Amino acid sequence: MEDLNVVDSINGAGSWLVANQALLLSYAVNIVAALAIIIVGLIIARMISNAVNRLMISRKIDATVADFLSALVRYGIIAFTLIAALGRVGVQTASVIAVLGAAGLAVGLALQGSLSNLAAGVLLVMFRPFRAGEYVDLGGVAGTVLSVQIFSTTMRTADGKIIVIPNGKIIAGNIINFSREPVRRNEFIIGVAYDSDIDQVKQILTNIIQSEDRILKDREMTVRLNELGASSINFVVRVWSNSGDLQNVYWDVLERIKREFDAAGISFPYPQMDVNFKRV
Amino acid sequence: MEDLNVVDSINGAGSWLVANQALLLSYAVNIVAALAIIIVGLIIARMISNAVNRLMISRKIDATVADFLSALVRYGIIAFTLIAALGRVGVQTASVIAVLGAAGLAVGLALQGSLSNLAAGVLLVMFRPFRAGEYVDLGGVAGTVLSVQIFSTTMRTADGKIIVIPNGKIIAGNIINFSREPVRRNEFIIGVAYDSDIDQVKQILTNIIQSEDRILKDREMTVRLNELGASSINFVVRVWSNSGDLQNVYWDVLERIKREFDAAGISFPYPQMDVNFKRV
Amino acid sequence: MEDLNVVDSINGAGSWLVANQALLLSYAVNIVAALAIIIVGLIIARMISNAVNRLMISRKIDATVADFLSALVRYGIIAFTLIAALGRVGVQTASVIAVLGAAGLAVGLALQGSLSNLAAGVLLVMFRPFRAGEYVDLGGVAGTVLSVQIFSTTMRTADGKIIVIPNGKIIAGNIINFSREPVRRNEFIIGVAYDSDIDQVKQILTNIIQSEDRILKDREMTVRLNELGASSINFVVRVWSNSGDLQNVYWDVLERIKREFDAAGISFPYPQMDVNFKRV
Amino acid sequence: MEDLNVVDSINGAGSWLVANQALLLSYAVNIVAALAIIIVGLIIARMISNAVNRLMISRKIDATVADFLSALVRYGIIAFTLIAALGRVGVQTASVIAVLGAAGLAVGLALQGSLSNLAAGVLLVMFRPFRAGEYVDLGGVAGTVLSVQIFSTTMRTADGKIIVIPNGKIIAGNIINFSREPVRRNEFIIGVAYDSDIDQVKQILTNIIQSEDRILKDREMTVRLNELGASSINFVVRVWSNSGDLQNVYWDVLERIKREFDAAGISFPYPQMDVNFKRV
Amino acid sequence: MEDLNVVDSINGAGSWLVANQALLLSYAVNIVAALAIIIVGLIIARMISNAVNRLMISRKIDATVADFLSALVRYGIIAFTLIAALGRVGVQTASVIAVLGAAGLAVGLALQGSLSNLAAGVLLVMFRPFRAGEYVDLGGVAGTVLSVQIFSTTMRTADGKIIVIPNGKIIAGNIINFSREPVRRNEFIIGVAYDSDIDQVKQILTNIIQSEDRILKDREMTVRLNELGASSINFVVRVWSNSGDLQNVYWDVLERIKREFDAAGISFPYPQMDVNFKRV
Amino acid sequence: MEDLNVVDSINGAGSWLVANQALLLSYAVNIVAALAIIIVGLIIARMISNAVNRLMISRKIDATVADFLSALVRYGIIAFTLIAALGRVGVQTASVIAVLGAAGLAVGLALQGSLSNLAAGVLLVMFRPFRAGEYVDLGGVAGTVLSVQIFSTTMRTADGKIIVIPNGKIIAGNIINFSREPVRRNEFIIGVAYDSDIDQVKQILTNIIQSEDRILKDREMTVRLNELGASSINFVVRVWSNSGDLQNVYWDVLERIKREFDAAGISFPYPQMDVNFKRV
Amino acid sequence: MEDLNVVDSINGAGSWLVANQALLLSYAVNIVAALAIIIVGLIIARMISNAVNRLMISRKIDATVADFLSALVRYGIIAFTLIAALGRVGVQTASVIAVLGAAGLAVGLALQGSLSNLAAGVLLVMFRPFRAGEYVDLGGVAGTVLSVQIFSTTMRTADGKIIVIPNGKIIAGNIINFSREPVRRNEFIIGVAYDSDIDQVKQILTNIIQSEDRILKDREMTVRLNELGASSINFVVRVWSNSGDLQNVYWDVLERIKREFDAAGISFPYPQMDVNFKRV
């Protein structure tokens, strides 16, 4: 367009930039004021966030949630400072909040799971359905809980494993607790031959469970016929013992059951099979 | 830019701060008024929440929902106080509500599952499909319910387990109740040899179930041939008894069935097999 | 700041509170008017909700949906009541509606599933794919429906078990009705030895079902060779009978099949397999 | 506050209500006119909904979608009436529209599945991938379709079952149509001994399938060795027949195969095992 | 209220309707003009939708998307028509746009999957990963594709089945194409006795695959020992052939393998089993 | 209404249309201007989209993402053009943007999956975890990658199969790469009789793996007893070789292992069984 | 319409374009100013994003999150510039922000998961549940972690595999760490004959584990009878050793157990089976 796209417009057109010097000075002053407002807002936001966190901690509020609200307050104040600065810039204060809301929505979509994990961790720590050192199962993975972080928990399996579970999945599934009740129940299933004397087996098992000191005598001690298996008669034995002695009692009772069953002549049956013959 | 970025602008420029002292005093007064508004709003919010909770508790409303809505009222009032305080400050009253809405959306995304669990727990307590001490199954985990908390239920398995289930998953799945009906039905599957006399087996089982005092005689007592198994004829026996006697009746009936079947000469068959010889 | 933070500002500054007496009186009048508006709105909302529920119930509308929409009307009217009250207070009427909007969104985040269950209950009660008293299957659980509550369905398993299913899950999955069609079909699979005479077996099975009075002769009665099993020839028998006689007909036909097969010399084959011998 | 909360403000203060008699009359007139507007809006909404449904039914539009959108227009008109009435009362129409939007959002969250089922039912009826009377499978459940309702389909399994499937789930999964194609293919798997003559077996099967009049001779008829099984040589036989004769042809061909193989000396092999002996 | 609810207000109060006749005439004129505007908008929307559809179809655009966005334009234009008409009625257009938005949101929640099905159909038709007559697998169901409709795809299984699959699910899962490559590979697993000569078996299989004309000699033809099975040595044979000859080559090669293995004395082993005697 | 619905209103009422000729001309001019604006906006949108696509392609931006932003810019510009045109028509510019927003929301609900697939494809191209010609597994389906299109990826399975997978699914699941490392590990499980000499077996396996030139001697070569099986002692052999020689090394080592095990007298055991005899 | 659609309107109508020359010049000036604003905004956005990233990197902020926030600021500033330019051209500044919000919503739906992957990757690096070179399990896939990229992780399975896992799935599932604890536990299951001497077996196993120097003697070393198997007495042996020696200890202990069990005469039992003879 002849001279419209040349020095008549670029390089300030010689005198066009000079004639607009006052406008440039005003814009520079506005930008400087906006930057100063930004700096002041950041400083006051950090100060007020620290102050409110300290105040909340004093009022018996948990550290994690107090930090969460302190960070939320800090983010709100810095967003307010950005609103004020861009209003001083003159961007209608509406597109500014729209852009900030879009950015916050993107950040929320990014976090979602992490924030849910944080909330679940807060709930876990304040209800404490399980605590450090307590043996519990967490939805298919069982072990001793070491500690509960803000986003995840660390638990040690009996074999020395280290397992980290996000806190969000913890509250969604079941919380299988092994070490809450001081007393728990063992269950033995014993297979005997079909010709074995039921009364003798019951009496022997009753003697075995009677001779154990770690079995709670004041609770139920079930020794009864359970079901007629395909190749073996199955007896069910249920006894109660302290959670600490649960495993040892199981092994001791099983070893004894084996020993007296061998001595008494009661036979543990191999898989029975019945064969009929024809010639061809 | 020469002297624009030096003491001519920083350190109050000597007299610029002196001239702006009036505006600084006005802003300080505004900030003090806003802080006083925040304090009085927090105090009145706490008082109003306590008052409304106390009032509605008397109106036969459940404690959990009353506390929840009292907390909602308190949060609403503190948000309103923040709106008023920042309007006094001059943060356009629209960016403030937008940022508060974004924070509330983040908090809602955080809670989601937990707050749904709270709603579910409210539903369970007043409908009471199950209650403390009642033996129920909650989708693969069965035990005695101990208590129904606001977010979760603690239930004890028959073996001494302590099970914690979030309330939200409870209502989503089936509620399998064992102890609501005072009378329940047992089922026995008895395998006998193919050459066994059907009439004799049926008559013996009928005698066995006739002599049991804990079996309800006024209800159906089926002793019928069920299906021709691969290696055994299977009879089905169904009897009804009070829920407290179910297991004892099952065990006693099975043990008797074994005794009279042994005495009558009816044989429980091992896995049957027919073998044909070929020489190679 | 010298005396700015002392009695010159606190305790009403002596005369500052006195000079502000008119504004405090005006604010007290505003608060009293707002509270009176709240009370009037609550009472009128309750009256209007009761009136509309009573009116629409008479117009052949279901009780559950009528109660739901009456509660919705009551909540709406109290929402307008709070809007008007806080406008009287002077809370800009926009932050107010934003606050109740966030509260309603949180309430929805509570509901989802339970409100869906209520809607599903409405659909079930109005379409009645099943009705109380009949035997149905609702996605893996079978039993007799006892009643259909507004949130859940109570059904009794054939063994006396009490089963509670949320209404929402029922409509999402299949609804199998065992008792809708008055006539149903049994299916027998009979395994016979490979050397058995096919014509004799078919003729005997035809005789057995011909003499059953509870089998519908006007419908198809298939007795045909179904498949050549690994160890047995399998015959399929399909007969139709009234739903009330299905199990009894099944049991009687099976017992007869066994009796005449024993008499006719037709042998039910045990698991067949032949062995080739080598010495090593 | 002395006499602020006494007869001086309650019970119309003697003359305060009288001085406000004109304002009370104006409010009463406003309420009466608002109720009249509501009644007029309701009646005109009903008239317009009926008129539009009648008009669109004539224009070859399906009844279900026409009724749905007529109800939508009815709800829109009553919503407009509520807006007009509540705004003319002076509620600013903004809280009014927000409350109605929240109620509509709650209703939509409640429906969701039901409305999706209605849309799916419309799609199924207008595309008719299956039609009432034909035998089809809908994702694991097979039977004859009885009818397609607006919300769900009733379908009868071959054994007399009555199964109701929500329309939404139907369109999400596969629609397996057993009866669309008039001709279908049977498949036989025949196990014969390893020493059996392959040519003789193939020739016998070819004779068997050649003599069947219901087998389409113009289509492929494969009789070929399929795979060398663990204990048997497996032949695959594939023939085509009209969908009405599919089952009968299967049974007839299987029975003829058994009869000819018995006569021809070809042996169906029992499960094979090879045994090596050692003494210990 | 004395005479407030009598002929003094109902039945037009005699002269009140006479006085308001002018307003009634104005309202009637407004309603008539609004209805005329609705009619004009509807007809012009239909015309514009048809015109834009035709013009864009002329511009090499697919018919499905053309009809879709033409319907979108029609719905948009009728939406503007409703906005204009209801604004001329005096409904402020804000409640109008909110109600129409709520209706559109409900319609979208209804459609959702169906509209996704249309988009998936468009993607499949324009990318054509498969086409009519091409034998493919779409996630567990395999067959010859017949046609691809806008919402669902119809395909015929090899046995005469008719399969209808929504387009949305097809694109979400794997699309396994069976006939895109003109050449494909067969795999044979041959079990032989442990004492069989490996070199003889390998040489015989090599001759068998050498004597087949339909096996591509220019591609890999592996005949190697694959793994030492429990009872049999398993050889793997992999050959390549044209997709049209894949099945026939498999059957021919298997039948030959059987014939020359019988001729050469190489034995296909039955499940070998080892037995030790002890007397008891 | 007498003559209100007749020629006095229709057919322009004779002179009513004539008296409004200027207004009709103004409306026609407005419509013509709006259509011209639409045409100009479409042309300029296409031009600017082409220009920006070319510029981004020149600025080392990937072709797919450049095309995506070009299409986004074109759609945005045509949206602004429609806004301006309907503002010229006079449709309040707010209902217009609401209608376009609803249309865009519907289009987004339609695409959703496709747009996610496009983004996943862009990520897959730019990080290239796999590349054309490289053999990988992508969640249960393995084969050689042919190409990665914008919406989906194509793969050839080792048997010549054709698989097309959406890109969105690829990034969601694991990307299992077979051909990244130049060296990979084989694993042999060898079952031997319980009486076999462990030292002899280990020495023979070591001799076998030493003589293989394609086995990397600089890496670990594990030959150790792994576990005591039910019927066989299982040795584990792990060797490393270049990815190109993996299968050939496996086959050669297995065949040798068989040969020297036969030569040395070490026996591969058949399934062992212990039988105890009793007479009945 | 006569001459309305001809040169009187097109080609600038001769003088109509000339009369509007000033308006065209003003529009061209506005467009040039808008383009200059766009260029300046892009330049300043790039400069600010480069500066802020460098600024926060110095403040001990992670590189990934710093780059993410820098990109967010750049996109925000370019959006602000677009708002300013489209305000200058005169598009009401409202439809502009609506279109940009729709585009951002589409982009968010596109990335959605990928952005969540970036957030998960940021979470992983700071808490480092696993680190490069550390052998861990990622929910069904186990291997040595090579590196943690921003969207995915590369991990090498023990057999030379290359495994790529999206970061999002990592944080959602369990994280099992095999190499965090320096000491881990072994578990041996040893099956012995029923007649074997329990004390002898226990003493021999204890002697085996006492003689291993790599087994931690200060931790539990359980050698107890575990359960009575179908055909074998099963002993459980649990020992603890350093993670580096786990597999070697396992192999050595197993080989010894075999050797001294062979020497001591203790027999590993083959699958026992019980056979009863009958003649037919």
UniProtKB/TrEMBL annotation, chains A, B, C, D, E, F, G:
Gene3D superfamilies: 1.10.287.1260, 2.30.30.60, 3.30.70.100. Residues 72-112 form the Mechanosensitive ion channel transmembrane helices 2/3 domain. Its main location: membrane. It is found in: Cell inner membrane. Keywords: Cell inner membrane, Cell membrane, Ion channel, Ion transport, Membrane, Transmembrane, Transmembrane helix, Transport. Homoheptamer. Mechanosensitive channel that participates in the regulation of osmotic pressure changes within the cell, opening in response to stretch forces in the membrane lipid bilayer, without the need for other proteins. Contributes to normal resistance to hypoosmotic shock. Forms an ion channel of 1.0 nanosiemens conductance with a slight preference for anions. The channel is sensitive to voltage; as the membrane is depolarized, less tension is required to open the channel and vice versa. The channel is characterized by short bursts of activity that last for a few seconds. This is Small-conductance mechanosensitive channel. The lineage of its organism: Bacteria, Pseudomonadati, Pseudomonadota, Gammaproteobacteria, Enterobacterales. The gene is mscS.
